[PDB]
Amino acid sequence: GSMKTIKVKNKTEGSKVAFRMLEEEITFGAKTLGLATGSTPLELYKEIRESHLDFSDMVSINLDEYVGLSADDKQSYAYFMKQNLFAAKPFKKSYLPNGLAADLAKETEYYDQILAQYPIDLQILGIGRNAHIGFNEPGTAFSSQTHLVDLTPSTIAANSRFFEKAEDVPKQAISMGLASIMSAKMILLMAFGEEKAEAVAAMVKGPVTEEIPASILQTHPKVILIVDEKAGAGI
Numbered sequence: 582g583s584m585k586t587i588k589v590k591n592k593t594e595g596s597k598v599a600f601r602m603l604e605e606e607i608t609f610g611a612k613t614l615g616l617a618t619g620s621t622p623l624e625l626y627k628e629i630r631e632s633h634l635d636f637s638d639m640v641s642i643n644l645d646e647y648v649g650l651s652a653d654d655k656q657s658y659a660y661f662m663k664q665n666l667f668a669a670k671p672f673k674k675s676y677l678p679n680g681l682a683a684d685l686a687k688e689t690e691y692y693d694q695i696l697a698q699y700p701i702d703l704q705i706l707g708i709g710r711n712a713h714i715g716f717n718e719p720g721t722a723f724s725s726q727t728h729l730v731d732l733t734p735s736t737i738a739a740n741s742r743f744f745e746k747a748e749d750v751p752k753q754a755i756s757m758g759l760a761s762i763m764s765a766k767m768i769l770l771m772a773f774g775e776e777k778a779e780a781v782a783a784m785v786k787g788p789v790t791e792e793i794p795a796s797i798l799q800t801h802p803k804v805i806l807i808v809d810e811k812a813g814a815g816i
């Protein structure tokens with residue numbers, strides 16, 4: 582069934598709450614974490630880095646990797662995760678899609694199998710401005726598992742700034758789908774700023790439609806939404 586909301590003043594305070602909750606899940610037996618990228622968990626990550634948490638018997642799973650990038654590429658999500666978390670607080674094993682996979686359909690099948698092998702205890706998520714979840718854009722099937730995503734033109738244009746040559750900018754990603762993500766025992770979603778207010782309301786109040794990827798979270802048995810006052814204006 583259910584979705585608890587914690588409303589908070591701001592991002593910093595929502596990030597402290599997320600930290601406290603993470604630490605409890607871990608003390609109560611969580612071993613596999615699904616992780617988030619983007620701006621939303623950056624302060625939660627700094628807090629973890631400076632904390633006494635120890636992920637050395639734990640496994641982490643990220644949603645996404647860019648096709649064509651290695652883990653050492655500065656533009657990769659593997660590298661993002663290293664910088665913001667793994668260098669300071671390594672896991673037993675941290676999984677991301679292999680963006681260098683020879684057979685994209687084989688890597689997608691592989692990632693599903695890793696999910697089956699390490700089901701996620703706690704998944705951290707952000708939300709997109711159009712209610713996208715990971716790289717799953719409106720119209721994505723609620724049945725989707727790991728799959729090849731063509732990046733939005735806004736994403737390619739944004740990421741283009743970071744590559745000397747245009748022929749080197751990823752146009753695609755290997756991404757956990759909506760059914761993939763929904764398999765977590767517990768989901769903690771964080772949303773801060775007015776830019777998220779509309780996606781937040783649609784996730785909570787709108788119908789369950791592929792038009793709002795996050796609306797599937799309405800059907801998860803254990804979703805915890807942490808939202809600052811502005812992102813929660815609608816709920």
Ligand SMILES: N[C@@H]1[C@@H](O)[C@H](O)[C@@H](COP(=O)(O)O)O[C@@H]1O
Pocket residue numbers: 617618619620621622706707708709710713714715716
């Ligand atoms: N990079 C991100 C996703 O990984 C993220 O969860 C979401 C919101 O991004 P942010 O947390 O920067 O607002 O949209 C993009 O696709």
